[PDB]
Each structure stands twice: as C-alpha cells, then as structure tokens.
C-alpha cells in the first residue's frame, strides 16, 4: 500500500505507451510518402503529453524521497531501498531523455 509502487506502476504503463508513439513518431519521419500534417501534429502531441506526465510523477517521487532520505528508518524504510527508488527514477528518467532528445534532434 506504499504510494511508491501505486505511481511507479502508473510511470511504467506511461513509458510503455510513449515507446509505442514514438515508434510511430520515427515512422512518420520519412515524410509525406508515409505521413498526412495531421498524424505528425496529433502524435507528436499525444507522445509529448506522456512524457510531460512521466516527468511530473518522476518529479513527486523525487521530492517524496528527498523528504525520507534523511530519516530512512523513521518511515521504516532501508536506504538500499531507497536507493533502488531512486535508480528507477534515473534508468526512468533516462529514458526520456533520449527520446526527448531525438526528438529535438530531428
């Protein structure tokens, strides 16, 4: 019943759908022989809205840690847990990025 895993599991369906768009997104990028103005403009903006929406959870999940990370016990929770947390938030994160980034590369 931790809150962690409720929105891990959330950001995880989020990222498996925003590999799907972006699949497609890549596809689109060959041009007007493959691709119409209007499903460049709507899948670019469905794929943009799921990243928007894993980095904002990402980013509750960081502050929450950040408030934890100095009393781990207290909230009877292990640092090497927390710190596991924290790597899914980094592999997460990067993820994103790389997408983000082919995207602002093309």
């Known amino acids: 019943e931790d809150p962690f895993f409720v929105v891990k599991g959330e950001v995880q369906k989020a990222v498996n759908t925003a ?18 103005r209007e499903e460049i403009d709507w899948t670019t903006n ?23 990370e100095a ?16 790597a899914f938030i980094t592999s997460t994160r990067q993820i994103v990025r790389d997408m983000k980034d082919q995207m602002s590369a093309s």
């Not at 809205?49 to 990402?58: G, H, T, V, Y």
């Not at 009877?76 to 924290?86: G, Q, V």
């Open 71 to 86: 009393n781990p016990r207290k909230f009877n929770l292990d640092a090497t847990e927390l710190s596991i947390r924290k």
């Open 19 to 36: 590999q799907g768009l972006f699949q497609r997104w890549t596809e689109l990028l060959q041009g007007p022989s493959a691709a119409t």
């Open 46 to 68: 469905e794929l943009r809205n799921n990243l928007r929406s894993i980095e904002w959870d990402l980013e509750d999940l960081d502050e929450t840690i950040s408030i934890v």
